[PDB]
Every structure is written in C-alpha cells, then in structure tokens.
Amino acid sequence: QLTEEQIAEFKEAFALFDKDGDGTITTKELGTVMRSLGQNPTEAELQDMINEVDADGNGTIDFPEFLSLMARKMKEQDSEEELIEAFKVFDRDGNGLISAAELRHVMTNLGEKLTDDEVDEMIREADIDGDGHINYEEFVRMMVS
Ligand SMILES: [Ca+2]
Numbered sequence: 142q143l144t145e146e147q148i149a150e151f152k153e154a155f156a157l158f159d160k161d162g163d164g165t166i167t168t169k170e171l172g173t174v175m176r177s178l179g180q181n182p183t184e185a186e187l188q189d190m191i192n193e194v195d196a197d198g199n200g201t202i203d204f205p206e207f208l209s210l211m212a213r214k215m216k217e218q219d220s221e222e223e224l225i226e227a228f229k230v231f232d233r234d235g236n237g238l239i240s241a242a243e244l245r246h247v248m249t250n251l252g253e254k255l256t257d258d259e260v261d262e263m264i265r266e267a268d269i270d271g272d273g274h275i276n277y278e279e280f281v282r283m284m285v286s
Pocket residue numbers: 158159160161162163164165166167170
C-alpha cells in the first residue's frame with residue numbers, strides 16, 4: 142500500500158495542518174492554513190470541507206482519514222494530468238480551443254485521415270457552447286463519457 146517514506150511525507154503534510162500536534166485537524170486549523178494561503182473561509186465553508194474528509198463524524202480529521210484522502214486526490218490528479226496534457230497537444234496554437242483544423246491535423250498524426258465533414262461532426266458532438274471549437278471542459282466531458 143505505502144512505503145515508510147510515503148508515510149513520512151504524508152505525516153509531514155498532516156503536521157502542516159495539525160498546528161497543535163494533537164493528532165487531529167480541526168476547522169480552526171484548516172482555516173489557519175487556508176488563511177496563510179490567501180483565502181478566508183467562513184466557519185460554514187470550513188465545516189463542509191471537514192465533513193467531506195471526516196469518515197467517523199467526530200468533527201475532526203485524523204491521520205488515517207487524511208491518508209485516505211490524499212490517495213483519492215492524488216489519483217484524481219494523475220487522471221487529470223493526462224486529460225490535460227492531451228488536450229494541450231490537440232490545441233496546437235495554445236489558445237484554449239481545439240479548432241477543426243487542429244483536430245484534423247492531430248487525427249492525421251494518429252493515423253486517421255479524416256474529412257472536414259467527419260471532423261465537424263466530432264466537434265458538434267462535443268460542442269456545448271456552440272462556438273465550433275472544443276474547450277477543455279468540453280474535452281473532458283467527452284473523454285470521460
Ligand atoms: Ca490539531
């Protein structure tokens with residue numbers, strides 16, 4: 142599951158939030174960290190964040206709860222990573238929109254020599270805002286479906 146070095150790294154991350162070293166992260170402590178990073182959530186917002194991680198409902202996050210998170214977040218991060226990178230490759234000019242011309246060039250590079258009407262159908266299927274291009278959200282929604 143985890144090496145001793147992985148555990149030590151995630152103990153150091155936990156310690157950032159567990160200000161007082163009691164083995165738990167409270168809403169106040171999460172707020173202190175958030176504030177240090179430029180965001181000033183309310184108590185209600187902090188409670189929602191704790192509730193999302195607090196598997197036993199005792200009101201605080203312990204080390205085991207924080208390991209189970211962080212392994213959920215990191216996997217989400219690695220998926221994300223990928224869809225991203227792909228996307229930036231299809232988006233040949235980097236403007237945040239995959240055009241029909243871009244999609245055609247990268248499909249040819251993937252071995253598929255497509256017509257304009259084939260690529261336009263691919264975009265129409267995925268296009269939500271109707272601009273005839275694919276943005277990242279459209280791209281993700283179509284990949285994960
Ligand atoms: Ca604490």
